[PDB]
Point group: D2
Chain length 499, copies 4
């Protein structure tokens, strides 16, 4: 709508969103329904591209898009991104409504994602802190004497941005931004679950001046996207999604540069000297935000004996006072999960915990096909490691609570999951904090706050099953750029006099 | 021998080299013959590890090796590497003899590789220019106000170093060095073709103090190594080899950090204003060194009309005056190719060129199962692109010569191969040079010199089919290390007064 | 005017500009006339502050201004600068008119300075590439084992910005920008000759939100400014002016951080392979722009035998076709010099050159008290070094032309002046260029272009008599900021296990 | 002796040390006695250079020394420094004996300084982390479009190293090392009080290969050194000494690059949660080491109410159990002060404190012309600020103890002195620590340890009266090096296609 007026076609029924084929919106492949977790109803359809159009798009992106993007000076590229931000911002409510509707995201969380996407675009100027190579004089070795080196980065070419359902707007804007600010062409592939926000952003970008042959948005479901990843014209693949899909992506792609943000949940550690008010408050929010559908959501809480009681009590109270329902009501604190399937898994995981010695301390009641209460399950340390909620990531509002004797047990348990994205530690003692910071095997540690990736003001990414490489203002240059080395030989030419 | 006295076991016949299993030398798997390209004779045997020993080694490297390496302070780790250099250096001739014998490398080139390996170890102190994270103050965004960030690198854990046959000693030492200087454990997997130099270096390292449970040397042939790459305890894979094997490696490994140095040959461009003496001299050497068995070997020469004649003439003269035979004779300029198979391919490729309009300008005569003359094949521009010598990398001393009308044709042809490792340009005009530097799609460009990776004083790596990521003093930190972000939240705590 | 309506007071006669005293505009000291080089007429008066007000201002800047500036978050500080840019830009013509009138600057050059000042403000976001300290792990020495370091920069406090007459608007905005973007308070002290543009910018900044107690503009003539430089509350002094005044400034200030941009002219070298059209064009402009009143103005031209003739001829033609007069006429190419005194010196210097063997090739005729023709004086190498035009900087449109036999003589002569700000070299041979780049003792070298500092997109500053330290986007952080080191001791505390 | 055999001349009596005149040892100026604080006896004489020899030395350093140093490749320069370290190390005892004798330094502290000097030389390889400029692409502004920049550092030329009496060997080696590793020539000017260690180091360097015309050691007393500082051939001045002398140095030198390490003492803050054992132990040592003759010595202790008692008690006990006397006895903990004059001042300062309400808690008794007891003087907060021991730096083993109500009072008092070199904070709460780190106006803060500059593994330097700029591995490059900018103009030349 609004910016998509000429694009969207209302074929008797729901609005139909076509793919962008690096030049023109279209698509001749199967049409696919897009539903809302609020009521399982169809709110639109997206046109997927035919194999022939995928092939043609890639050919355009490669043969022409790489140069449109690279040959547009940086000052112009940034102008494009700044303009795109302006457009998205004046269409805020429209962007947010689609998020609430398509993603089942509470109105406040939906507004937050639009603002993040706007800010990310505007702050592309900070990504520039990573522009500018290195000079390497040669007189520090006899073999390189009277030699000189210059190392600078160049865009790889065509970057494939694969996006998850839980941040349908931000992830797309984020990847497009860091790929473009450095001069790359981009193939965006959003979750078929909620691909509407991505189409809206791509249009805003095109309206803002983004080289028409340098970007693409293909509505391809799951494995049909493999055609893109495996293509040799795709020099990089920026993927945010599940460990399991990420694995398949690399196996299909083969040699290329990758950024793999594979989530998993995060553990939170509470030391005896922690401000329990802050802790309880932050931990509770970390558990339920967006119905736990945040890769940086808290899935396990670990607290030392002397504060475990209060802490768990306060968090349980907090989770209990939450209001569930339709996200539209700014009254509601928690909306629905992306699918009934996801709730099924959460219920099963809660049963498993109880059978293995676990006790629910708050929530636990399913309220509908896609509605559930944010849950907090207590578990004894000697039994938690075998619980599904521990061993795996149950993408839902549910966390385990475990009493520990000391920091070492806290750390050990925190590290015992197969993931290593972020971790949180509340407490005040520098030494204990330092210890934790060194031994927690995660990409990021939040001291006295819940894990919050934000727009990547601070880089993030995983360790272990949570992936490889980071995303962040500036740091993302490593995934979409390659080094170029220039060596000059002046031996005997008289520049230097033996040196 | 010497440092391998207690290790090597002479079971009636040839010396038998066991694998190092992160603690003790051994192996209960098939024994494999190691032959010399000088006379196809068996010079030794290596003991491959059983699946059970591979499993056990990885378990040691992971559970214990990661910590031995990480918990050894850096000052101590560097001492180890410096010591290892001392040991290899006093055993120079021994190391070189094995290179000449096992790799068919001319005595001078063999001495050069030992010296490179010694220097690489000693210069691990320069890799330290990449130690030391980033501080990120939070007041440049309202959402991060009263927040702070610290980003530092940590070793990934266990790094798998897969090595090629043409630099059997250097590549191994190089990878072990940058992996260890940053605190990682390493599984070295040398080419089964010439795994002896690697065993010698590993022993020197162990003798020097390298944590015994933090390193491994497994004599596994080709695909049996996949067991290592695919294992989850292997967090990184540093691979130097062929495009085709590299592809398989990533597909087997899945998500992990990779450095893929996939070679291919390099093109050399000669402008009308180039010093043709230097050019001819450097280009000829770039063509024949180590019998063209250098990933950075020149495979194509492009020269502007007015100098093509002289240039090709001078290079042909030079290639013609070379002496072939056994590498032992410091008289010989060119030894044998690693296998008769490699020569077969070179002969076939030369035929193909001639059939497609090509004419030999020097060499072309096979001198034995593993001996051939360094060849220079002339080809008209309108026909070279379909020639096997162009489309592929014929790992042998053979290059195509092509006359071009101008720099644009030179660049176009240079970029027309599927590889993009390095490229060379001889000439003096800044503008033409700048143009070439911008448009040549390669990891590195050598101005007025032949492509020479050396010890990585200047980083190198490929573009296109030549791979992803770089190796170099300092730059290699990106492949064996991961970022750790620490975010501190001081909101309302009184550190800052609104700012 | 416009933004200065409430500020400027028209006391029967000319407009009277008061000083800004870190809180309120005012001043109780002598009033001073401000004249225009276009007609020696008084166009305004500035109120200088009393010793008591200087003292009070410094006390405010120190006790309160340092914190207003430091405690304003960066995101807010940048907003202030961006806003200030908007204000100056909408008042462009007003800013430019005052420049043309007060500085005698040609309308186009005046518009250029306003745009530079606007751009400099807007690009303060690029100065941020220099925000963010260093982490220093301690295990690379035994004595620092189990220790850790963090190094970050902090604003020094109160920065004194002393400004020259030739870039009355830019220099002021530039210094205020880099001092403020990092959190410092600023005392601006413009040339009493043309202090009006500075007052206009300061007002725009105050209007934009600049903490009122964190900035000051004092109309103090020459030596009366010493009171500021010598004060201990002034932690830094950013000075752009003459070598001789800079010398006095440091001697008065004593220990503090300084940036000393002391100008002098620049030499231009033309090699035999240079595009003489470009060369002649750029060199001529470098000679006459703003009537040679540019610190980066060309004062000496050196060309190799074979091109000297044409080059000097083309430049002479060009200088000859220039139109002199009042700057207002967009027809005029050259306006007046800041004072008749400056012309006196130029005429004397031209006489000296001729007496010492020099011959005028273009210009030489004085056209009025403050008007002169852009001059080009030929001089034989064996006699040029004793000429006033060589030994000194004659701030006027005049340069020496000298034929040389080769690059070495060119370089030698270029380096023979007491200054070392910038230098220019036209030619195409990489080796000769490299040679020149290494041996020219200057802060900056321009290849195939005239020296052009611009807004400091590329850092600049001098060597020898041209000063110390640089100014530039990002690089200026060194002059207004100080390092803070934080060392943490964890010995025996259990963070590390021997390492 | 030993390495000074041919140099030192025993003219009937004490050994006579000549100055090194950039080529040959000598000197025709007044001879000066060098005495030992252990017994006020003359242990040697140094030959000062005549004005004519100073002039000649500078001329050599400038005309020839700059190039010997710059034209010696870095790999060779480092070899020189590594060799010099070897020589000093094998002559350890000799170096230490002279320190104990000439500086009155306890044998252990003397051995420590020799080891520091050895390590500093060997670690010059870590200074290399600061070698290698910046590439600046031009397409981020329209005015710099099709332009490019390269910024690299060059040695300034001739660096003057002025050294203090308390670290007669280290400071000299330190300054020579960072000046030389980057390619500068050096004029060393040691304290006339104890210039012997410097002569020994210079000889070791000359023996190690240091270009003979690139270094100088001039035995000039106080103000006679001004001749050096004021000379235009001296491009940099690295000075470690008193605030007052530093001030004079800059006023004499004028415009040049300076590093001013002006000391003053340091304050130590003890929070209620601090390990009082560690605190007391570190604080006591910080008070008495080298008889308080350390610029980083503790002069003021501030502890929160609840721990003040114990803390002061434990420190008093510790200071009391110290043994004073001749430094030779490894039994002695404290040797003499450099002169009786220094003790006079300490006694006067202790009287002043008592008169103003202060009470001695330990020590206070003078034991001889140059011997005193390490003292701890208690003072009430409401009266300490007017005490001489607070307002000034009494270079002796004496500190004030002051009870405070909270961190804010601690910080306020800590910041109340005119100095700002380092500061120490003992405690464990992150927030309180963070607060202190932000508000303490010093160049460096030591958390849970006494201020210890060491060899500059972590950079240090002052704020306020303690100076400007830092010294440290790597960081010192800023004081002895200058930037060189190279801008390339390719406008319309066809490198870029509009970008
Ligand atoms: N890019 C660079 O910087 C660079 C540098 C040097 C060389 N190279 C290139 O690399 C090649 C080196 O020669 P090469 O003939 O030895 O090539 P290669 O066969 O590709 O070398 C492969 C290395 O990988 C191992 N390997 C083979 N199959 C494997 C599998 N399925 N799984 C895991 N590991 C496997 C090999 O062991 P086995 O010996 O047991 O098969 C060998 O150690 C050349 O093409 C050269 O151009 C590139
Ligand atoms: Na692939
Ligand atoms: Na895998
Ligand atoms: Na002063
Ligand atoms: Na001076």
């Amino acid at each position: 709508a609004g910016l998509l007026e000429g694009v969207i076609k209302e074929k008797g029924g729901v609005p139909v969103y076509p793919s962008y084929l690096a030049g023109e919106w279209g698509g001749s492949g199967q049409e696919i329904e897009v539903k809302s977790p609020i009521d399982l109803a169809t709110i639109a359809k997206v046109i997927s591209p035919s194999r022939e159009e995928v092939e043609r798009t890639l050919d355009v992106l490669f043969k022409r898009g790489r140069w449109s993007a690279r040959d547009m000076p940086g000052t112009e590229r940034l102008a494009v991104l700044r303009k795109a931000a302006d457009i998205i911002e004046r269409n805020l409510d429209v962007f947010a409504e689609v998020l609430v509707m398509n993603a089942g995201k509470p109105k406040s969380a939906a507004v937050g994602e639009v603002k993040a996407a706007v800010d990310r675009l505007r702050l592309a100027e900070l990504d520039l802190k990573k522009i500018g190579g290195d000079y390497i004089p040669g007189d520090w070795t006899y073999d390189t004497l009277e030699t000189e080196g210059l190392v600078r980065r160049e865009p790889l070419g065509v970057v494939a941005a694969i996006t998850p359902f839980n941040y349908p707007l931000f992830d797309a804007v984020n990847k497009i931004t860091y790929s473009f600010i450095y001069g790359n062409a981009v193939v965006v592939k959003p979750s078929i679950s909620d691909p509407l926000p991505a189409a809206m952003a791509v249009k805003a970008l095109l309206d803002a001046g983004f080289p028409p042959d340098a970007i693409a948005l293909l509505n391809l479901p799951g494995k049909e996207a493999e055609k893109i990843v495996a293509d040799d014209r795709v020099a990089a693949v920026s993927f945010t999604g599940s460990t399991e899909v990420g694995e398949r992506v690399v196996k299909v792609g083969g040699v290329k540069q990758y950024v793999m943000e594979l989530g998993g949940g995060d553990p939170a550690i509470v030391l005896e000297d922690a401000d329990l008010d802050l802790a309880a408050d932050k931990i509770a929010r970390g558990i339920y935000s967006y119905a736990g559908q945040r890769c940086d959501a808290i899935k396990l809480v670990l607290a030392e004996r002397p504060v475990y009681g209060k802490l768990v009590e306060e968090v349980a109270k907090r989770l209990s006072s939450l209001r569930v329902g339709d996200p539209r009501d700014p009254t509601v604190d928690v909306g629905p999960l992306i699918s009934p399937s996801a709730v099924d898994e959460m219920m099963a995981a809660i049963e498993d915990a109880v059978e293995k010695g676990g006790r629910v301390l708050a929530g636990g009641r399913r309220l509908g096909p896609t509605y559930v209460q944010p849950t907090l399950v207590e578990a004894p340390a000697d039994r938690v490691k075998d619980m599904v909620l521990y061993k795996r990531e149950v993408f839902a509002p549910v966390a385990l609570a475990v009493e520990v004797k000391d920091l070492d047990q806290a750390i050990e348990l925190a590290n015992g999951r197969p993931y290593g994205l972020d971790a949180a530690v509340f407490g005040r003692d520098v030494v204990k904090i330092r210890r934790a910071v060194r031994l927690l095997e995660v990409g990021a540690i939040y001291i006295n706050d819940m894990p919050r990736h934000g727009i990547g003001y601070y880089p993030f990414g995983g360790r272990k099953k949570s992936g490889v490489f980071r995303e962040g203002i500036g740091y993302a240059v490593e995934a979409v750029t390659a080094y170029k080395t220039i060596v000059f030989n002046y031996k005997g030419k008289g520049v230097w006099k033996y040196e």
